[PDB]
Amino acid sequence: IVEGWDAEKGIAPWQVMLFRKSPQELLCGASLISDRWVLTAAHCILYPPWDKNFTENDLLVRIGKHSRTRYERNVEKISMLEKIYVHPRYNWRENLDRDIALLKLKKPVPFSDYIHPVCLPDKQTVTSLLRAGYKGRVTGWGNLRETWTTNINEIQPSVLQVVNLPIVERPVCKASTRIRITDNMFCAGFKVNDTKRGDACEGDAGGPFVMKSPFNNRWYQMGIVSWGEGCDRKGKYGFYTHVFRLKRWIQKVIDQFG
């Protein structure tokens, strides 16, 4: 997260860490949507060009974390995965269209003050809040800047970061990149000349872009951090998987269990 700030404990209890077993590595962010299912980005799991195709036996999820590197004994929970389901029409070759995957936990995870699921959006919530200028919040343990100056450590956070970002008009998103933007994605970030700056970065992918509905006071996950061209580059915006649009697929997989 660039230009974000340290998270308060429990500020995003659905935040999950996708952790590679070997070598040990923080791969991406992710979100808890129930005590058995976790949502993340498909490119965090499958990417043929780099021979990437992680299976359920290759990774773990760490739930309830705050520190990026410490083992938060008695607070976090480390779970194995039973199965992983990548969207069948995820377009890795061209634009990462439908960048979403569901991870099914081996055992359901007990909730706590630091472990609690986020809501998936309904039509009403999407039509009233997913509009240009409305702010969503992104969290993650990703890099603090696109790159470092002197030492690598200056850009690795010690704890989970949070940043608030405004949704950007579709024509503007389209004009900012050569990539073909589909209806399955939306973009956010401050304009080429706002006071504020902020964006997701390397390591935040798969994490959630959330909004708090004024209608029922609940937090909804409207997007999944998907991709960007650099981090916090003026004139560029971060792109997100439009979760509501892929809700039917989520429902299909869950009740089918893939």
Partner: peptide
């Protein structure tokens, strides 16, 4: 230099 603090195999859910 282990970015990550180790955790016991016994502690995994």
């Amino acid at each position: 230099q282990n970015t990550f603090e180790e955790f016991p195999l016994s502690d995994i859910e």
